[PDB]
Homo-oligomer: A and B are copies of this chain.
Amino acid sequence: DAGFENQKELTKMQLDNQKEIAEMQNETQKEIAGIQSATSRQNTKDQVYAQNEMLAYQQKESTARVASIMENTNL
């Protein structure tokens, strides 16, 4: 049955091709997920930058306000 070994060769060609295509698709999808994640992270960092830089100033000012308030309250 040369027919059988031949058929096995053709079948394997097809299966190997399908597996290669699937692998490239999976890799593509993971790369795209990478890009989406990187973009989302960088976006979030850019968005929170100002509130994070204002933080220490707002804490300092709040504390000064409390000191003032309590001073006035006592007298």
Which residues of chain A have a CB within 8 Å of any CB of chain B? 1-4, 6-15, 17-26, 28-55, 57-75
Shortest A39–chain B CB gap in Å is: 4
Complex Cα gap A25–B59 (Å): 50
**Considering residues A1, A34, A40, which has the most beta carbons from chain B within 10 angstroms of its beta carbon?**
A40
- Given A28-B30, A33-B32, A53-B59, residue A2 in contact with residue B2 (CB < 8 A): no
B71, A75: Cβ atoms closer than 8 Å: yes
Complex Cα gap A1–B41 (Å): 58
What are some 8 contacts across the A-B interface (CB < 8 A)?
A6-B7, A19-B24, A22-B25, A34-B35, A41-B43, A50-B55, A53-B59, A68-B72
